[PDB]
A paper describes a structure:
In this study, we report a detailed characterization of ΦCjT23, an icosahedral temperate ssDNA phage with an inner lipid membrane, isolated earlier from a strain of Flavobacterium (previously Cytophaga). The virion structure determined by cryogenic electron microscopy reveals similarities to members of the viral kingdom Bamfordvirae that currently consists solely of dsDNA viruses with a major capsid protein composed of two upright β-sandwiches. The minimalistic structure of ΦCjT23 suggests that this phage serves as a model for the last common ancestor between ssDNA and dsDNA viruses in the Bamfordvirae.
Within the asymmetric unit, type 1 trimers circle the five-fold symmetry axes at the vertices, type 2 trimers reside on both sides of the icosahedral two-fold axis of symmetry, type 3 trimers reside on the icosahedral three-fold axis of symmetry (contributing one MCP per asymmetric unit) and type 4 trimers reside between the rest. We determined the atomic model of ΦCjT23 MCP to compare it with previously determined MCP structures. The improved map quality was sufficient to build atomic models of the trimers de novo. The outward-facing EF1-loop is used by trimer 1 to reach under the spike penton domain, and analogously by trimer 2 to reach under trimer 1. The capsid-integral part of the spike, corresponding to the P13 N-terminal penton base domain (residues M1–F91), sits in a slightly raised position relative to the type 1 MCP trimers circling it.
Residue numbers in the entry:
A (entry chain C), B (entry chain A), C (entry chain B): 1 to 239
The structure:
Amino acid sequence: MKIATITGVTKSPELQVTKAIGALILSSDVALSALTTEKISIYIERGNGSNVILANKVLLKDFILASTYGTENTQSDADNAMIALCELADEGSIYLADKESIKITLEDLISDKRYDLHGIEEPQQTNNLFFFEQKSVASEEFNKKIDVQGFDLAIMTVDDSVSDLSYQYSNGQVVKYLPFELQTLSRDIDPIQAVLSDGKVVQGLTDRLTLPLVAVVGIEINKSQGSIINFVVRCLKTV
Amino acid sequence: MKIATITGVTKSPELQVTKAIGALILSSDVALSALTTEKISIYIERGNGSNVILANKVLLKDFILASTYGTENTQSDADNAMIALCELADEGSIYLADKESIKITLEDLISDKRYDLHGIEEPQQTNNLFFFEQKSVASEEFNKKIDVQGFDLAIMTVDDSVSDLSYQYSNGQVVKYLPFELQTLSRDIDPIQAVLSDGKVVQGLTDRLTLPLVAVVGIEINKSQGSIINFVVRCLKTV
Amino acid sequence: MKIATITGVTKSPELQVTKAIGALILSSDVALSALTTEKISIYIERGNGSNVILANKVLLKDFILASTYGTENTQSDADNAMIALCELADEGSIYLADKESIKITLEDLISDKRYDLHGIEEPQQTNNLFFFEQKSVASEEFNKKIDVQGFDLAIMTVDDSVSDLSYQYSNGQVVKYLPFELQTLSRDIDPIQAVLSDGKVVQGLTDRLTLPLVAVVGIEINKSQGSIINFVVRCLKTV
C-alpha cells in the first residue's frame, strides 16, 4: 500500500504502519549514485518500551545496496529515476500481535526532491527479521580488526587510503586482499548493480563496495590516517 | 532446421512439420516493442483422432513474453532486430506416435516485414506440453474475478485505468496490489526483458506486464470504464 | 597479490609463483574484442613426478571466454578497459608441497599497450585442475568428427565456410544445427557476455562462439574447403 510521499520538507514525520508488511518499496526522482546524506530509521514498537530496532539512522545508499544484492537490482522508469525493493523478513512478513506498529522515519532529505514509500503485504507470517548494524574506525589509527561472525553481507566505504583487507575464516586461514582484487571478486557474483532509465547499466558504485561473508570470522583493515571507514553489516535472526 | 521465411504477403500458409521439434525460434527485423497485431497459431494434427490445440490466434508479443520469462530474454543481431526462442515441451521434443504433425500459421502480418521460423529438436521425447489460454475483461464493466488455478504465468495488458489487482491464494488470504507495486515485484525476478542491437537494454514493455503466479487461485481486477483488459495465461500438462 | 605489469615489451618474462593461488585476474587497457594475437602459457613444475601442462600457448580471447561463461562476465573500470577473472582450480587452489611452483608467461603482445597479472588465493587446497586443449580442422577437409567426451565447454571461431555442426549425445541420437541456431541456443544460457565502460553491454563476439557441451560425446563439423577451424576446449580432472 501507499505508505507515504515526502516533498519539500527536509524530514519525514513519524510514519506508522499497523497492518503486517514484509517489504518496502523506496522510489525517488534522484538517481542512486546521487544519494549523499539521506538516512532511514525503522523500528517496531512492542509496547511499554523494549521496542525492536531494525535500522537506526542507516544511510539510504547503504540500505539499498545491502538489500538488492544478487539476481535483482535497482529499477528505473520514465516517472521515477530510482526504485528499490528492500525486504524486512526472511520468507513472509512481520507479525504484530495486539498493539505493535512499525515506525519509519526519514532524515537529512533534500529540500527540492521527492520520495515515496510503499509497503508490500504477504500472505505468510514469520519471526525471522533482518537487522542492520554499523561499524567504524577512529580515523587516527593505522589498522583495526573487527569480528563479522554471523553477518552474511557487508557494505564498506571506498577510499584511496585503504591499503590491505585481511580475511580470517573459520578454519584459521588468513588471506590478504587489495581493493582492486576485492572489487573484482565482488563483481563476480553480482555483475550488474543498477539499470538506468535511458538504457545504460552501472555495474558498481564508485565509493561503495559489497562484500559477501561466507565462513568468515574476522576482518582486518590496514589503512592510513585521514578518513573514516564505515561498514554496514546485515544479519538475519529470530526476534 | 529452417521452417519458412515470410515477406511481402500478410498471411503465412499453414506450414507443416513432420520432424519432432522441441522449440521454435522467431526472428524478425522489427523490435519486440514494435509488434502490433501479428498472431500465431500452433497445433498438433492427428490423422485419425482429435486435434491438439496449443495456441489459437495468440498475439505474437504475448507468446514471446510468456516463453521468454526468466534468466533468458530476447536478443538481437545485425541482420535480425528481434530473435526469440520459445519452448513447446518441458524438457524435450514433442513425441509423434503414428500420424502426428505440427501445424503452424502466422496471420495479420505487415506487408513490408520479414518473419522467419526455425525449429529446434532434442534427443529426448516427452509428453508434457505448454498450453496458452486467453481471458478478457470488458470495458463497460467495473470489476471482475477470474480463476487462475493451475496456471503458473500470465501476461496482462497495461492501461492507465486499472485501479487495483487482488490476489487470492490457496490458503484463503487476500492481498491487494497497486499496478506500480505489481510492476516492481514483476521486475524483481527478471530484471531485463530484452537487449537491443546498439547495446541498450529494455527492462519491460510499456503496455504489457508479466505476472508469475505461485499458489494463487483467484485474480480480481478493479478498474474504470474505457478499455478492455486482456490476460494470456500459460500452463503445462500431459496429452 | 600482484604478479607482474607488462608495458613496452612484446614478450613477458617468465614469471614464477610459489604461493598457492586459486585464480588469475587479467587486466588491460585493450578491449576484449580488440585482442588479436596475445597468448598465455601456464604450467606447474613439480619435484616429484611429471610437470603439469595446463595451458600451452592459448589465445587470450579464448582463454578469457572459457572462464567467464555462466553468470560471471568480464567487466571494466575507468583505468582498465578489460578485467577478467579466470579460475584455475575447481573450488580451492592448486596444492604445492615443498618446492613445486607455477610458471606463467605471455607471448605476442603489443609494444604500446599495457597488461597486468593478479593472483587470488583460497583458504582451501584441491587437486582438481582445469585443462585447456586445442583441436584443429584443416582447410582441405570437407567434414571432421571429434570426440568431446569428458569436456564441458568449447569455443569456436565463427566462419562463413562452416555449414553444419552435429551433436552426438550419450544415448546415441545425432542432432544437426546451423550456426544461427547454435548461436541462439548459446545465448539462452549466458545472455550477456561483457559490459563496457560507457554502460553498453555486449552479448557476444562477432568472431567467437561459445558452446556448452552437456551429455555430448561427439561433435561433427561439415563445411566447405578454404578455411581452417580452431576449437578451444576446457576440461576438469583430478591430478
